[PDB]
Point group: C3
Chain length 169, copies 3
């Protein structure tokens, strides 16, 4: 216990490491370089596999910096215990496709990228480099009971059926 | 303990079941058939109610397959302990509305749907059938302390106020 | 133990309080008034700081009411233990920018706002008032093991490398 097995699947892969000593998540490095146009979706390889023990789940989620500064949206992945495959980052460039054109790509600091040779890109296009920290992994314990069908619940609650903004705002 | 009460609210409802033995979440079946246009939002009924015990929360979240293959975005729901109402799936078709037209709907495998009779749809429109697994439920334990206002914290940390991409990328 | 330190950073800040007795999250009050145009992104100040103890993470996430009724999308924040800075709400108005114009803003109940003096707004624009509950905070325990590189995992699983809709739909 108190150890997690990690396998690197290629030379493009880098070991997860958490920022601060008491930090929740282990920052994830991209194992490939990808340009994403507006509204373009993709699964980004990390070339990294883990072995989360039973009774736990992994949360492959976004970082506050990247997600707040750019239009790169990462759908939080639920990494099952026993999944030994390549961790994929479920991502979308949710920048609107307004049909505009530029010569500058954006990095994940939302800074314009200057290249020697000039190409035409769709506005709002991003580039992710191999080795950049675009995500992180947080492991939490789960409760996994056997399900039992009932006609009525054992105990009545104060909440009942209240939902979706019932307490208001 | 080690059991969760589940109530089926109609004949359209189906019991949650998890895929693998050590899997984190219980796949959720839609209890209705719905077509969603681009940018259309909805709450999808499961006709299923649960009784998560105190000290736990339910995460009504997305599946990797559906979310990565389609523009169907599910906002992760936080199912409170004691909520005995109908579990609703908070969903949006975030496909852009470009005013294009087609005769093919898409399923949640993003495959074109062929019908005998031909209708005109907005491009990027999806159809969810009753009985399809569009989501899953993961239960985790929560910490629920009493709050105490302070002027200063008891212990100084290494992180302090650092946030939003402070460690960089 | 069983207590969480909370610091209010200004007179605009309000103490987090959970809705029901067994509720998972503590509703978060905005400490500022902001208008968000379509596709506009921002980090919204709460002027509130907490001291989550080691072994835990905070989930600064959305409410079902606001998120389902409006186009205001909150990216779930992972609040590290030891972070004593101002809690920021990572938000985007994902309403499409169709270049339409109106005289009515929308509140976070998606109701049209009537003002004495009439201004022109982009359609799909929202207004968040100081003091409104736009988010909530749920704290869960985390597992934080030391990482160990391996060439192969200790135990073979039933899942293996199966992922992204492998069980189908
Ligand atoms: O996606 C969801 C989210 C929540 N729910 C249920 C469970 C939850 O207990 C209830 C409300 O959860 P929230 O407290 O997170 N939303 P809100 O604060 O707007 O509702 P309320 O005012 O009643 O607390 O609605 C769903 O059915 N689906
Ligand atoms: O929505 C959020 C997310 C995070 N935070 C805070 C808490 C968290 O401890 C801090 C940074 O969290 P992350 O590590 O997930 N983001 P990032 O990796 O970009 O920042 P840093 O480089 O400092 O770790 O910012 C917020 O205030 N709101
Ligand atoms: O973002 C993700 C999400 C999941 N995964 C992995 C881990 C997880 O164990 C696997 C599938 O997770 P889900 O069960 O949540 N998705 P789905 O139900 O569509 O796949 P499957 O049918 O195999 O269970 O894919 C990723 O690599 N990245
Ligand atoms: Mg970080
Ligand atoms: Mg969008
Ligand atoms: Mg699954
Ligand atoms: Mg609530």
């Amino acid at each position: 216990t108190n150890t997690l097995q990690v396998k690197l699947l290629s030379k493009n892969a880098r070991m997860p490491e958490r920022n601060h000593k008491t930090d929740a998540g282990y920052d994830i490095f991209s194992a490939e370089t990808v340009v994403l146009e507006p509204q373009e979706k993709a699964v980004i390889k990390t070339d990294v596999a883990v072995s989360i023990p039973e009774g736990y789940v992994g949360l492959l989620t976004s970082r506050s910096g990247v997600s707040s500064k750019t239009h790169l949206v990462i759908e939080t992945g639920k990494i099952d215990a026993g999944y030994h495959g390549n961790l994929g980052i479920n991502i979308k460039n949710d920048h609107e496709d307004d049909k505009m054109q530029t010569i500058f790509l954006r990095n994940i600091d939302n800074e314009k990228i200057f290249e020697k040779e000039r190409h035409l890109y769709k506005l709002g296009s991003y580039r992710i480099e191999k080795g950049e920290r675009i995500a992180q992994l947080v492991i939490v314990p789960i409760w996994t009971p056997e399900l039992k069908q009932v006609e009525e619940f054992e105990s009545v609650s104060e909440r009942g059926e209240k939902s979706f903004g019932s307490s208001g705002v």
